Ligand SMILES: CCCCCCCCCCCCCC(=O)SCCNC(=O)CCNC(=O)[C@H](O)C(C)(C)COP(=O)(O)OP(=O)(O)OC[C@H]1O[C@@H](n2cnc3c(N)ncnc32)[C@H](O)[C@@H]1OP(=O)(O)O
């Protein structure tokens with residue numbers, strides 16, 4: 001594998017291409033509360049929905065602040081389109097920098113997300129224009145590769161993973177149409193099936209602290225090394241992406257927990273999950289779904305190559321994650337079939353979701369990597385070791 005083309009730093013245009021009449025390019029400054037609000041306004045009403053128009057992802061302003069001003073970020077990579085007259089923000093596309101490992105080669109990339117066009121401007125071929133412009137801004141800063149996900153099929157996906165959903169408040173999810181009541185059942189039986197213990201079981205389990213950063217950093221990168229495609233975490237990235245800062249962040253977005261061994265007092269495990277609401281588009285009884293998403297995790301047990309033992313360890317840890325997520329009043333716990341997740345998704349009663357999330361690399365060729373599933377789109381322990389990066 002390797003890059004597809006070499007970019008000529010001399011030929012990168014200093015000026016952007018033209019836009020549809022009445023619109024103009026605009027760099028967003030997300031340290032400005034009004035501009036953060038503008039992006040949130042756009043996304044809230046125009047970002048990704050399900051195919052039945054029942055739900056729309058509802059990234060919080062705190063989430064956007066977190067996701068988009070990560071270590072190394074540049075405002076030049078927060079790209080907006082405005083209406084010239086009204087000044088209204090009508091489109092966005094965003095990137096942040098990170099390093100990834102693609103089959104043992106380290107690569108500097110941008111992670112691309114929050115591509116969004118106002119519904120009234122759809123189907124006008126603006127998306128290629130947005131893509132080309134963020135590409136140009138990246139090129140100017142010496143970045144020539146990207147990684148991203150999408151639910152739509154685009155040329156040469158590097159992998160695909162299925163969505164999985166673990167009901168925490170099943171009744172909530174029933175009343176919003178998220179979860180069905182099967183023909184043969186009752187509310188009580190569904191609540192029974194999804195019931196969770198009142199307390200966690202892993203000994204030594206506690207919220208991650210800043211003092212844990214170095215140890216979690218070491219453990220995480222050793223664990224992610226087990227995957228063909230993975231994120232090459234820096235220390236500042238562990239701090240930013242895993243350690244909630246309550247003093248300066250009003251609405252918590254990231255939860256992290258470590259296992260401090262009772263005997264050695266070393267960190268032997270950790271897991272984490274983030275808060276991403278969905279808007280319930282039209283419902284009498286509810287306005288939102290409060291969802292938690294599984295993010296990064298690691299365990300020393302992985303390094304024995306004893307899959308039964310890894311399976312056992314993950315079943316306990318991930319059930320603890322559910323209980324903690326429930327305690328934090330999340331309605332549902334979501335995950336993908338990446339990492340070692342096929343080892344626990346079905347047994348801990350995650351229900352299979354619809355379709356796949358596809359993973360893409362820009363300007364980089366590599367062989368497809370396994371995404372946790374077989375040909376039937378079902379979790380498969382023999383199809384792991386592939387995708388070791390979670391994106392937002
Ligand atoms: C070196 C640095 C490189 C950095 C850049 C790397 C590449 C980054 C790539 C971007 C990563 C984004 C990652 C995320 O954020 S994925 C999230 C995408 N956002 C949404 O789903 C929000 C709801 N939808 C919308 O806002 C619009 O429907 C969007 C903007 C998605 C399409 O707007 P619209 O419906 O008005 O379409 P058009 O008439 O302007 O354009 C039609 C063309 O656009 C292609 N299209 C449609 N959907 C996507 C999609 N999700 N990824 C890439 N391409 C897409 C489509 O195949 C067609 O191509 P073609 O027929 O010409 O082949």
Ligand SMILES: Cc1ncccc1COc1ccc(-c2cccc(C3CCNCC3)c2)cc1
Nearest residue numbers: 048049050055056057163278334335336391392
């Ligand atoms: C509840 C909801 N909100 C917005 C759109 C669709 C839906 C439907 O139910 C879903 C519940 C969960 C997911 C989901 C689960 C795990 C990972 C993801 C990725 C997370 C990164 N961005 C792409 C989606 C989505 C997708 C859909």
